[PDB]
């Protein structure tokens, strides 16, 4: 009934891969797969556990059985870095794995952070962000912690992530903190330290409202 | 060739129903055995239930089961995807493929937005470049939108000028029910007593096209 798939890899050009995607219950060969990157819609890739579905470059091999099956490429290019998804076309409802998504493997890039203090439109509208960047960097596994007046914060703060860039493969994040007009002008300090698999020392961020 | 046609973007109300269309403009239908996933903001492919013509019956997968009902009528060679009791986790991308196992040919997708929030232009707000908004000789600008509703709303500066380190970032849903995003562009420390910026959201659920303009 279920299908299993690890989420993510990593991996560089013209490297060999095999996602593995395995079955609760036998399946035999009703194992499907398919291809697809943002945007974008399901392009078949694989089926019969291993046909090739037309139009599709000879590094892409399916193969396996029972149970447990298996996504092969070959050799890897630009394009092959999508998110892969395994469906069980067996039983009467066809099941689909987790996913997994292959991103392009390069050398750690530090993140660049940027602590943009609220507008005034938006103060004088009744609320206010406060907006942390953080640009090209990789991996893209940043922590973001907020702080205020000293104190350490959660749940006020919301994240989030640009899809990694063909050019130069790196990532940027934008930790946005919104507070109430009042809530907000009752506090000094106002930073956001950043530990990162790039940085020995977390680097801190911030401005002291009222100025 | 086979092509998949399927019904106009939704926003009903946490609790309305939906039925969705999917029609199919290729060869034959009878056979095609359509079948219906959805995808909810960057998650897996789910789904929800196929069926077959000639064979009039379908089934429907587990947790969806009883809030559910595809059809397809032939006579039109269109398939229908009826979801009631909405929920806030039933909003996402509806496609319906075919397959005439395999799965060939899918539909353009479908969004349904299911929230008790309504329709809303965004704000927007220019994330000023000043001290802690530089290092070296890069600083960096941006324009933060906010509280909008439904997806999506694009975003292009000096009017499509301005192309280079322009970071769009993905929408983000709020507990208040509006999504918000922001796009900075790190440019030149110079160029900023130099040239002109301004970003061109557009939010066109809401007839909207907002023009700010960002400064130290």
């Known amino acids: 009934i279920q299908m299993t798939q690890s989420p993510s890899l990593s991996a560089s050009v013209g490297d060999r891969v095999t996602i593995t995607c395995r079955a609760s219950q036998s399946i035999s060969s009703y194992l499907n797969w398919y291809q697809q990157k943002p945007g974008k819609v399901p392009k078949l890739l694989i089926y019969?556990?291993?046909s090739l579905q037309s139009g599709v470059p000879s590094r892409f091999s399916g193969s396996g059985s029972g149970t447990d099956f298996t996504l092969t490429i070959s050799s890897l290019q630009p394009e092959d870095f999508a998110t892969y998804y395994c469906?069980?076309?067996?039983?009467?409802?066809?099941?689909f794995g987790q996913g997994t998504k292959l991103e392009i493997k390069r050398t750690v890039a530090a993140p660049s952070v940027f602590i943009f203090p609220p507008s005034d439109e938006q103060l004088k509208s009744g609320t206010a962000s406060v907006v942390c960047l953080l640009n090209n960097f990789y991996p893209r596994e940043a922590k973001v912690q907020w702080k205020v007046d000293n104190a350490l914060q959660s749940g006020n703060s919301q994240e989030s992530v640009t899809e990694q860039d063909s050019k130069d493969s790196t990532y940027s994040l934008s930790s946005t903190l919104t507070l109430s007009k009042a809530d907000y002008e009752k506090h000094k300090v106002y930073a956001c330290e950043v530990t990162h698999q790039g940085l020995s020392s977390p680097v801190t961020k911030s401005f002291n409202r009222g100025e | 060739q086979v092509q998949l046609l399927q019904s106009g973007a939704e926003v009903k109300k946490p609790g309305s129903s939906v039925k969705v269309s999917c029609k199919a403009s290729g060869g034959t239908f009878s056979s095609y055995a359509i079948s219906w996933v959805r995808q909810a903001p960057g998650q897996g492919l789910e789904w929800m239930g196929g069926?077959?013509?000639?064979?009039?019956?379908?089934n429907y997968a587990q947790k969806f089961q009883g809030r559910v009902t595809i059809t397809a009528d032939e006579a039109t060679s269109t398939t229908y995807m009826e979801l009631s009791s909405l929920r806030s986790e039933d909003t996402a991308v509806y496609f319906c493929?075919?397959?005439?196992?395999?799965?060939?040919?899918w539909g353009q997708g479908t969004t349904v937005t299911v929230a008790s929030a309504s329709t809303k232009g965004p704000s927007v707000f220019p994330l000023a470049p000043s001290s802690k908004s530089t290092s070296g000789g890069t600083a960096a600008l941006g324009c933060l939108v906010k509280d909008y509703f439904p997806e999506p709303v694009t975003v292009s500066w000096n009017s499509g000028a301005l192309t280079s380190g322009v970071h769009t970032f993905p929408a983000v849903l709020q507990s208040s029910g509006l999504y918000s995003l922001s796009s900075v562009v790190t440019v030149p420390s110079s160029s900023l007593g130099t040239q002109t910026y301004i970003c061109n959201v557009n939010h066109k659920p809401s007839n909207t096209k907002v023009d700010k303009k960002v400064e130290p």
């Open positions: 019969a556990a291993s």
């Open positions: 069926i077959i013509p000639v064979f009039g019956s379908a």
């Open positions: 493929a075919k397959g005439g196992h395999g799965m060939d040919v």
């Open positions: 469906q069980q076309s067996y039983s009467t409802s066809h099941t």
